[PDB]
Amino acid sequence: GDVADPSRTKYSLQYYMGLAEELVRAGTHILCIKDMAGLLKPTACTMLVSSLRDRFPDLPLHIHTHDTSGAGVAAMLACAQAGADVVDVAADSMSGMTSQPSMGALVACTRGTPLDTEVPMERVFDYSEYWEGARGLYAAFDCTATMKSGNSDVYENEIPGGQYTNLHFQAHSMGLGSKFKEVKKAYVEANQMLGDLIKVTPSSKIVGDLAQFMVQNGLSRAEAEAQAEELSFPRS
Amino acid sequence: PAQNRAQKLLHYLGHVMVNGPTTPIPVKASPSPTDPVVPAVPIGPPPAGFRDILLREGPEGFARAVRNHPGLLLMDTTFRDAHQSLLATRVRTHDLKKIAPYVAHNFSKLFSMENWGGATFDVAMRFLYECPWRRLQELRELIPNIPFQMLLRGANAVGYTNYPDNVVFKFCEVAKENGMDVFRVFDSLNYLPNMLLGMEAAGSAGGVVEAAISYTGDVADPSRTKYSLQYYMGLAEELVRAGTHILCIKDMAGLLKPTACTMLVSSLRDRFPDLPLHIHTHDTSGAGVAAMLACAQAGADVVDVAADSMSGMTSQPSMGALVACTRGTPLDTEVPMERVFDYSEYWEGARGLYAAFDCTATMKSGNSDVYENEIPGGQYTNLHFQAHSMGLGSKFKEVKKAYVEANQMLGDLIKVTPSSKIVGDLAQFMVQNGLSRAEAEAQAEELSFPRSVVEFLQGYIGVPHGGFPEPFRSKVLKDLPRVEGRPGASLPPLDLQALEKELVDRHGEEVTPEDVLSAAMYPDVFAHFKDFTATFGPLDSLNTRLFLQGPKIAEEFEVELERGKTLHIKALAVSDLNRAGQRQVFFELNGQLRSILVKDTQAMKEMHFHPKALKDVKGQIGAPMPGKVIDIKVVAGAKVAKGQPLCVLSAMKMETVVTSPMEGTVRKVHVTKDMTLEGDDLILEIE
Numbered sequence: 001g002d003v004a005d006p007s008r009t010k011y012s013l014q015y016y017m018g019l020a021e022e023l024v025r026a027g028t029h030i031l032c033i034k035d036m037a038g039l040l041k042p043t044a045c046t047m048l049v050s051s052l053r054d055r056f057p058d059l060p061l062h063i064h065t066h067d068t069s070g071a072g073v074a075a076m077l078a079c080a081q082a083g084a085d086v087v088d089v090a091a092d093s094m095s096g097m098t099s100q101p102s103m104g105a106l107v108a109c110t111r112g113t114p115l116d117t118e119v120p121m122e123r124v125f126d127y128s129e130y131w132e133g134a135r136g137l138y139a140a141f142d143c144t145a146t147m148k149s150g151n152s153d154v155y156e157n158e159i160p161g162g163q164y165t166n167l168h169f170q171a172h173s174m175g176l177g178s179k180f181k182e183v184k185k186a187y188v189e190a191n192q193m194l195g196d197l198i199k200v201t202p203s204s205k206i207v208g209d210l211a212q213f214m215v216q217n218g219l220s221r222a223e224a225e226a227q228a229e230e231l232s233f234p235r236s
Numbered sequence: 237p238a239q240n241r242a243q244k245l246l247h248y249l250g251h252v253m254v255n256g257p258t259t260p261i262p263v264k265a266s267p268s269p270t271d272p273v274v275p276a277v278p279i280g281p282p283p284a285g286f287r288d289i290l291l292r293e294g295p296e297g298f299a300r301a302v303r304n305h306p307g308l309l310l311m312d313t314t315f316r317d318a319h320q321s322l323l324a325t326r327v328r329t330h331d332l333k334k335i336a337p338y339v340a341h342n343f344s345k346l347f348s349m350e351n352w353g354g355a356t357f358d359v360a361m362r363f364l365y366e367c368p369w370r371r372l373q374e375l376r377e378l379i380p381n382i383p384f385q386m387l388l389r390g391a392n393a394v395g396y397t398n399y400p401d402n403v404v405f406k407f408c409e410v411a412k413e414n415g416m417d418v419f420r421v422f423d424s425l426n427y428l429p430n431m432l433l434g435m436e437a438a439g440s441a442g443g444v445v446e447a448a449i450s451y452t453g454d455v456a457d458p459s460r461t462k463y464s465l466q467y468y469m470g471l472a473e474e475l476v477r478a479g480t481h482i483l484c485i486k487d488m489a490g491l492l493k494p495t496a497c498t499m500l501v502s503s504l505r506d507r508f509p510d511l512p513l514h515i516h517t518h519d520t521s522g523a524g525v526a527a528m529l530a531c532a533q534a535g536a537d538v539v540d541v542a543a544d545s546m547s548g549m550t551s552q553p554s555m556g557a558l559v560a561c562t563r564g565t566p567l568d569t570e571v572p573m574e575r576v577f578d579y580s581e582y583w584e585g586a587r588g589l590y591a592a593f594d595c596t597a598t599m600k601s602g603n604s605d606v607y608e609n610e611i612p613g614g615q616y617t618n619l620h621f622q623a624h625s626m627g628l629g630s631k632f633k634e635v636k637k638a639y640v641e642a643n644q645m646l647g648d649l650i651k652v653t654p655s656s657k658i659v660g661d662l663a664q665f666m667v668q669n670g671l672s673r674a675e676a677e678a679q680a681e682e683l684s685f686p687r688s689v690v691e692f693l694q695g696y697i698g699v700p701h702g703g704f705p706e707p708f709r710s711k712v713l714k715d716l717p718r719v720e721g722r723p724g725a726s727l728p729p730l731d732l733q734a735l736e737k738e739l740v741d742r743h744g745e746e747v748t749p750e751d752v753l754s755a756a757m758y759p760d761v762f763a764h765f766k767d768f769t770a771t772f773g774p775l776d777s778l779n780t781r782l783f784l785q786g787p788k789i790a791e792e793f794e795v796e797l798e799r800g801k802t803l804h805i806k807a808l809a810v811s812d813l814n815r816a817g818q819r820q821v822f823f824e825l826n827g828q829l830r831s832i833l834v835k836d837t838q839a840m841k842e843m844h845f846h847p848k849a850l851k852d853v854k855g856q857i858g859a860p861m862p863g864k865v866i867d868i869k870v871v872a873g874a875k876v877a878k879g880q881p882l883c884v885l886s887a888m889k890m891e892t893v894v895t896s897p898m899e900g901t902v903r904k905v906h907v908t909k910d911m912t913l914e915g916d917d918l919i920l921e922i923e
């Protein structure tokens with residue numbers, strides 16, 4: 001969802017704060033916000049992380065996102081400014097797109113501020129160069145075969161990074177590769193039909209299997225809900 | 237004269253089937269077999285945009301309307317800057333026209349669209365064999381409501397050398413007449429006298445003058461004193477006093493960190509409250525979206541963006557990312573996200589047609605080493621392709637290190653075209669010869685530097701901030717002539733009427749003012765472009781796959797020449813080689829058999845290279861690069877002095893003068909005019 005969007009009432013700021021209170025009462029050492037799709041906009045980051053920090057001044061706050069939207073670096077900088085203690089990053093050659101924000105970008109942007117990571121940039125470059133060579137050994141599995149950059153349609157479809165790559169490979173294996181735009185639209189419809197549940201493994205796969213099933217059978221949401229007693233749905 | 241357009245197109249298609257691509261392909265990738273899907277466009281004229289204000293109220297009215305706009309304005313680089321960086325400016329007029337009506341309707345609120353200047357002018361003629369002026373005119377008809385923006389070099393227009401002032405003025409006049417609206421005037425060294433001429437030329441044409449300060453260094457780093465905040469503020473004061481309508485910060489490499497953005501843009505806004513501030517960056521570091529958000533928060537009125545599938549890496553920040561991040565804030569762009577997605581999907585398909593030129597063949601993501609090397613987006617892609625062509629591809633890390641050393645040796649000048657190329661040529665020269673900075677500076681009287689480095693040190697591009705590096709300049713130049721002041725100011729006015737008459741005598745009565753200016757700026761390129769289009773016809777009518785790879789046997793396709801004139805073409809067969817060294821290509825054209833005789837150089841290609849220069853024999857002069865012999869300045873038996881010109885090589889589009897390392901007598905010359913040499917091939921012997 002989007003805590004900065006007052007029209008999205010199901011996954012509101014109050015929902016996140018109430019769940020954080022139950023997890024803190026249960027004795028968590030660290031509280032994590034896991035944005036598995038890259039949906040945290042910088043404004044939503046600021047609002048959520050400051051509210052958590054104000055409520056829990058002594059608790060470590062860890063923020064995880066994906067750079068699927070191409071805004072993940074800006075989102076993590078906004079979290080850090082709002083009082084996150086830790087952010088998830090990847091080596092630069094293993095960052096961006098459906099991965100985490102760039103380590104070198106975060107280290108460079110925080111340098112000489114109160115948020116400095118103290119990581120030497122030369123060490124990040126040598127680390128990235130190794131991973132650039134190593135990624136070349138995995139060209140047969142690289143998401144860049146199908147997705148050349150981040151995509152902002154993730155704010156509409158809410159498909160997690162690892163599910164996007166898998167759903168595309170599955171759609172291609174089923175002869176639906178030319179219809180992958182219809183599969184993404186059906187993923188939104190399937191999420192709503194299922195009740196707009198959080199989408200991460202395995203729930204992200206359940207929505208994916210339903211979306212492929214709808215596109216394969218030429219079904220709209222309304223037809224799939226009307227015929228729900230007659231249709232053989234995916235096992236998941 | 238009967239028009240023969242269809243036969244000329246079949247001759248091009250037959251040429252590509254026999255000889256391969258006419259455009260040099262840098263990587264073994266094939267264009268997509270599928271054409272891009274064009275999104276649906278409303279029937280009617282597009283909504284009124286910022287161009288309607290510019291046409292009604294002039295440049296100052298436009299600048300006031302930009303400053304008074306509630307929210308962040310966007311400018312689209314996809315039309316030029318985005319591909320220049322990603323696909324090396326290879327994007328064709330054909331693909332730009334297909335999406336243009338969609339842009340006009342859905343992006344009517346853009347500040348401007350950047351679609352012409354920079355490398356697009358030369359590249360259109362040289363490599364795409366299309367007229368850049370026709371591209372401007374046809375796009376202006378399809379997009380009547382958005383201001384068109386160009387990147388203009390101040391005293392060089394879109395060219396690579398300095399021109400007489402009357403050529404720069406006449407270029408800006410004819411560019412404005414052809415529908416150019418905004419002139420982003422920059423200099424490669426921020427050399428104010430070159431910028432002032434370009435501002436005066438663009439303003440006198442009735443264009444919107446946008447004076448652009450090229451950004452280098454780090455204003456947030458107190459150790460970097462040369463390009464300090466005070467340097468940028470002082471140059472901004474001179475450009476504002478010179479009557480700029482808009483002030484641009486041009487970060488050509490992606491060096492603006494969010495803290496540096498905040499500091500520079502707030503200081504400019506506090507100094508100039510009523511002046512529009514335009515910020516341009518590249519996303520080379522992967523921080524460009526965060527940098528543009530920091531500029532917008534610091535009071536920038538406009539930021540450069542690209543379509544999402546044409547953004548990131550060496551391109552601009554993502555349009556969809558900026559639109560999404562500003563939504564529901566005081567900086568909202570009011571652009572609907574669905575329209576950005578449809579625009580990106582078209583460009584994702586279109587980018588697939590250019591896979592043969594894609595920077596992702598060599599660079600898989602942005603790279604933060606740009607904060608150390610300061611290599612601009614378009615120079616990074618070109619420097620890598622050049623290094624690979626010279627057998628230095630495995631040493632590209634050494635080339636990047638040598639680029640830093642070369643920048644320092646040259647004096648840490650701003651690095652943008654052509655100064656970014658000058659540093660690149662020196663860096664490749666250092667790595668090729670195994671030279672450190674200290675060795676290259678020590679041996680500066682003995683070494684034959686790249687022509688671009690020599691011409692820079694002579695002053696042919698203007699004067700760098702802080703002056704030229706001494707004693708290094710004096711050692712390289714010796715007795716070579718030096719240009720003091722502005723290089724164009726000493727050139728006699730070009731007689732454009734005499735040139736028009738020469739072109740009419742050579743090409744017939746259809747010569748236009750645009751043709752005269754194209755010939756004035758790029759004589760050899762324009763001549764080659766006219767001869768090529770005289771042979772092969774209007775290649776802009778072909779889709780990009782057929783232009784690059786030609787048709788497959790039994791492939792059928794349509795070519796629209798003009799509204800209501802479609803050619804149905806099918807490729808049928810290619811014959812064996814005849815006794816004249818030609819193949820016969822068979823087509824069906826509108827249900828009829830056609831055949832064309834073509835020429836297969838590949839079928840019959842052979843050569844032999846004798847020449848080698850012993851590295852230990854000072855009198856044996858080897859070729860310093862692979863290249864073609866343009867001129868031979870000496871004969872056997874001639875006495876030669878140390879530093880005397882011996883031959884001229886033309887390689888990588890750069891005349892290199894080979895000079896004598898010693899005094900002596902030329903014993904033997906081993907080369908001829910038009911001979912192709914490899915590296916170290918023996919040119920001549922000196923005793």
Ligand SMILES: O=CCCCC[C@@H]1SC[C@@H]2NC(=O)N[C@@H]21
Pocket residue numbers: 162163166200201202204205
């Ligand atoms: O091919 C079969 C599945 C292979 C594992 C896919 C993983 S499970 C963790 C993550 N979440 C998903 O929905 N898919 C991936």
Ligand SMILES: O=CCCCC[C@@H]1SC[C@@H]2NC(=O)N[C@@H]21
Pocket residue numbers: 354355614615618652653654656657888889
């Ligand atoms: O292959 C020869 C050069 C082709 C044009 C390269 C363009 S000029 C504009 C931009 N700046 C550079 O340094 N290179 C590109």
